[PDB]
Design a protein around this ligand. Structure first.
Ligand SMILES: Nc1nc2c(ncn2[C@@H]2O[C@H](COP(=O)(O)OP(=O)(O)O)[C@@H](O)[C@H]2O)c(=O)[nH]1
Ligand SMILES: [Mg+2]
Length: 656
């Protein structure tokens, strides 16, 4: 019942509106006449449908899902052909090397043009599409579908998925079918030497010979077999299913994932169900009454229900309570998920997405790399009035338990609460989750960039606090040398206090006030960083001293030192990567340069080009629409944090 050869782990890549959801749903319908991953069945194949992100830019989720699916269906709206948006979702497939087939959807829709599609695919994407199918009918007359591989035709009696008849190819479409058949063999001839031979002599190849060669080329990323239909009026879905099993890869056809032994060495992980367990956790979902569901793909070895596993990322042993397969209609409990297969593990306390599971006494290997994102975007949230402020913090602190990659700071100047994430999009869904599904209404603020403040020469300063009746006596007096630290060494404190000069009991108070003051620098009231303070002197007033006095004396001192230390602002600098059609190389580079950018070099990927760059996060507000309207919809970028830099003198004189 389990055969790797017969797994088909796919995802459905689709443009907004192209029909992703409707295609997926109809695929579940047809496979069901018998959720992060939904399993189903087709002619003795298990298809695991990986849910891909609902818009392309979600870059992390993207990487995580493409990694876990094997093949893919790309869906096109055959009224537009390939859109700007359809182009972006192709590049992702191209980017992550995932073997693909196309689906010309919406064939019943006015403007339905198969060839509008096929051409844009060769033309704009450099795709080498192959006509696997011919349509019978046009728009509202789109009646059926011809298969030019097997030279059989299909007709659909209704929009419902209820009437299908295998017909002979109408004589009227018989010339065109014969045309695209020999072209198909012509294509398969590039992948099978004995089909070439057979081609040359006018010998018809076997139906299998032909499928195998299409498959081989689809998988090696050399061709993109193309199919069509209407998901909405149920036409051609079964054939597309058919195609998934035909041409789309099993766990075996794609090269194996790589991971790192604990000695630092990189290994290919090979899909042996009787080899060592190794598995990636790639999504957590909090099922209502089943519990906290944690979705995995198993790369090698077997995962057995009731067993104990070792989480190698968070180095702690977990226990696998139940194993589930999520179907369309129901949940199915299973004893075991073998190499190449997928599902959900129940129980599992401290495992978050990214985490690697191995089998207790198996190699302590690590599949997914490190970097936690610097929280570079801040956002303020005035609640309602103590109203939604009630449950927001309660919902924040469990939401911080399937995302460790975002800060929560209470801003102590004006008062609001501060969430700090990595991207604008990061903060936007965290906001839709706040308001929609955890019922928090509030004044959500505008995305401000996480600026910092530091000094550029050493200082030698003092702070005092001195009260006399108001209403008892107060005294605190320190002296500090503050010097610059290297970029991102952060805070260092040193106590060069002699002996009794400041009584040992007050040093904490000094440190507290120093830290307290460093949360608001003098330039733009942002956090102070990368400095080394040394308390070297001071004084005290013998009755009148106190923790309060020394604390303030430290705030004071610290704030003064920053004003004096030729202070400067630090801003986040992003590593940006722009995917442009080659015709816009120049006009896109100039814009980047115009955002104080600095180019690192364009390597081509596909028939596209990919420009690398450094650009201040501050200048990236609305790059998405700027690119779109400078590549004509066809551009797409990815940003990742790199480092902090001094702002130019111009920008400081501006931010204040
Ligand atoms: N005419 C037509 N409309 C379709 C077809 N497939 C999907 N749609 C429509 O496209 C709209 C959005 O579809 P959806 O699957 O949500 O697209 P998505 O945003 O890319 O996920 C819906 O109104 C669907 O009814 C099709 O084959 N023909
Ligand atoms: Mg959708």
């Amino acid at each position: 019942e389990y055969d790797l050869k017969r797994l088909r782990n796919i995802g459905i890549a689709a443009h907004i509106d192209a029909g992703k959801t409707t295609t997926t749903e109809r695929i579940l319908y047809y496979t069901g006449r018998i959720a992060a991953v939904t399993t189903c069945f087709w002619k003795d194949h298990r298809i695991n449908i990986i849910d891909t992100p609902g818009h392309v830019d979600f870059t992390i989720e993207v990487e995580r899902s493409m990694r876990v699916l094997d093949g893919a269906i790309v869906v096109f709206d055959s009224s537009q052909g390939v859109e700007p948006q359809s182009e972006t979702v192709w590049r992702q497939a191209e980017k992550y090397k995932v073997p693909r087939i196309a689906f010309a959807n919406k064939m019943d829709k006015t403007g339905a043009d198969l060839w509008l599609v096929i051409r844009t695919m060769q033309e704009r994407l450099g795709a080498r599409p192959v006509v696997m199918q011919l349509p019978i009918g046009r728009e509202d007359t789109f009646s059926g579908i011809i298969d030019v591989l097997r030279m059989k035709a299909y007709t659909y009696g209704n929009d419902l998925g209820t009437d299908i008849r295998e017909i002979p190819i109408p004589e009227e479409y018989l010339d065109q079918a014969r045309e695209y058949h020999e072209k198909l063999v012509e294509v398969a001839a590039d992948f099978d030497e004995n089909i070439m031979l057979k081609y040359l002599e006018g010998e018809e190849p076997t139906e299998e010979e032909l499928v195998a060669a299409i498959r081989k080329g689809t998988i090696d990323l050399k061709i993109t077999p193309v199919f069509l239909g209407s998901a909405l009026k149920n036409k051609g879905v079964q054939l597309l299913l058919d195609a998934v099993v035909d041409y789309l890869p099993s766990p075996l056809d794609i090269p194996p994932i790589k991971g790192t032994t604990p000695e630092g060495e990189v290994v290919e992980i090979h899909p042996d169900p009787n080899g060592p367990l190794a598995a990636l956790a790639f999504k957590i979902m909090a099922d209502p009454y089943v519990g906290r569901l944690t979705f995995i793909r198993v790369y090698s070895g077997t995962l057995t229900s009731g067993s104990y596993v070792y989480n190698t990322t968070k180095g702690r042993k977990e226990r696998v309570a139940r194993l589930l397969r999520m179907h369309a209609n129901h949940r199915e409990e299973v004893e075991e998920l073998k190499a190449g297969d997928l599902g959900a593990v129940v129980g599992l306390k401290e495992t978050i997405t990214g985490d690697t599971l191995v089998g207790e006494d198996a190699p302590r290997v690590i599949l997914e790399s490190i970097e936690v994102p610097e929280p570079v975007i801040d956002v303020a949230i005035e609640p309602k009035t103590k109203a939604d402020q009630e449950k927001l913090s309660q919902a924040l602190a469990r939401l911080a338990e399937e995302d460790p990659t975002f800060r929560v700071s209470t801003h102590p100047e004006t008062g609001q609460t501060i969430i700090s994430g990595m991207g604008e999009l990061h903060l936007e869904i965290i906001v839709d989750r706040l308001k929609r599904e955890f019922k928090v209404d509030a004044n959500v603020g505008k995305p401000q960039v996480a600026y910092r403040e530091t000094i550029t020469k050493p200082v030698d300063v003092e702070g005092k606090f001195i009260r006399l009746t108001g209403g008892r006596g107060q005294y605190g007096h320190v002296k500090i040398k503050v010097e610059p630290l290297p970029r991102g060494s952060g805070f260092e404190f040193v106590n060069a206090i002699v002996g009794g000069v400041i009584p040992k009991e007050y040093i904490p108070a000094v440190q507290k006030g120093i830290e307290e003051a460093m949360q608001s620098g003098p330039l733009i009231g942002f956090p102070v960083v990368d400095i080394k303070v040394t308390l070297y002197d001071g004084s005290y007033h013998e009755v009148d001293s106190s923790e309060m006095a020394f604390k303030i004396a430290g705030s004071m001192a610290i704030k003064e030192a920053v004003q004096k230390g030729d202070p400067v602002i630090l801003e986040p600098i992003m590593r940006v990567e722009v995917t442009t059609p080659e015709e816009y190389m120049g006009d896109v580079i100039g814009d980047l340069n115009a955002r104080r950018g600095q180019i690192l070099g364009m390597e081509p990927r596909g028939n596209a080009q990919v420009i690398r760059a450094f650009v201040p996060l501050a200048e990236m507000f609305g790059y998405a629409t700027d690119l779109r309207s400078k590549t004509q919809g066809r551009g797409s970028f990815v940003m990742f944090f790199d480092h902090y830099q001094e702002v130019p003198k111009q920008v400081q004189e501006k931010l204040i």
